[PDB]
């Protein structure tokens, strides 16, 4: 494959025991690190805040510095691929995990993601649709061996009450073939990201900007 230009997602699972299922498609610019995505519900109104689906709703769009391939782009490029496993542990006892898989067809990505979240209090901000935005975020990446990335960040939403809603997030990424040795020797790597989300109870329109860096200006 070449770098991606378009993508689809089917995302499904359960929040607090209630099933959900969404699909749609979007596109992005792999040299800039931008992507956008539209999603629509196949099982009626979401009963939880759609913001809880971020960051879950495609690092193939992420270049590394000076136009290098990120390990994600390189795994798409030679077709050997990767999967992701993410965990989000919320300050109020809720947890959400996801599993991520992809199929490539030329410059188009197809994502199949599965999520389980539970323990969201009925009066907390996820179940009351009170999340208003996600903070700008720096992700820290380490490669503990030649085919694995362990990434971590502190994830916070703003909410209608003025209190932030916080979680610890860890993303383990497992590659089909080893990561090139010139990528392995630049650790740690950071990525700055921004997101936007518009939503109804049945539809999401998401956008993301990402930029990798080892050092700041």
Footprint of a copy of itself on this chain (CB under 8 A)?
13-14, 16-17, 83, 85, 87, 89, 91-95, 97, 99, 114, 116-119, 121-122, 135-136, 138, 140, 142, 144-145, 148, 150, 152-154, 156, 163-164, 166, 170, 172, 174-176, 187-188, 190, 192, 211, 213-217
Q: Pairing mode, if any, of strands 203-213 and 18-29?
A: unpaired
CB of 85 to a copy of itself, least distance (A): 4
CB nearer a copy of itself, residue 44 or residue 144: 144
Q: Name the residue nearer to a copy of itself (CB basis): 3 or 127.
A: 127
Whole-number Å distance between alpha carbons of 140 and 190 = 5
Buried b (16+ CB within 10 A) or exposed e, 59-87: bbbbbbeeeebbbbbbbbeeeebbebebe
Q: How far is the CB of 83 from a copy of itself (least distance, A)?
A: 6
Shortest distance, CB of residue 145 to a copy of itself, whole angstroms? 6
Residue among 170, 168, 136, 172 at smallest CA distance from 152: 170
Per-residue tokens: 44: 């009626």
Cβ 190 to a copy of itself shortest distance, Å: 6
């Amino acid at each position: 494959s070449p770098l991606p230009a378009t993508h689809d997602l089917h995302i499904s699972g359960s929040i607090n025991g209630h099933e959900f299922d969404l699909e749609g498609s979007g596109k992005g610019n792999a040299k800039e690190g931008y992507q956008e995505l539209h999603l629509k519900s196949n099982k009626g109104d979401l009963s939880f805040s759609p913001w809880i689906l971020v960051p879950n709703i495609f690092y193939q769009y992420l270049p590394f510095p000076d136009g290098a391939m990120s390990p994600y782009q390189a795994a798409m490029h030679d077709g050997s691929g990767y999967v992701m496993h993410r965990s989000m542990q919320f300050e109020d006892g809720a947890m959400l995990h996801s599993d991520h898989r992809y199929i490539y067809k030329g410059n188009h990505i197809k994502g199949e993601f599965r999520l389980t979240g539970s323990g969201f209090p009925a009066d907390g901000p996820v179940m009351t649709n009170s999340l208003t935005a996600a903070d700008w975020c720096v992700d820290k990446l380490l490669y503990p061996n030649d085919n694995t990335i362990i990434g971590k960040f502190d994830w916070t939403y703003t909410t209608t009450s003025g209190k932030r809603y916080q979680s610890d997030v860890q993303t383990n990424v497992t590659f089909g073939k080893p990561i090139a040795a010139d990528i392995l020797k630049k650790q740690p790597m950071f990525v700055f990201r921004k997101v936007e989300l518009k939503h109804t109870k049945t539809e999401l329109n998401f956008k993301q900007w990402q930029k990798a860096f080892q050092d700041i200006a």
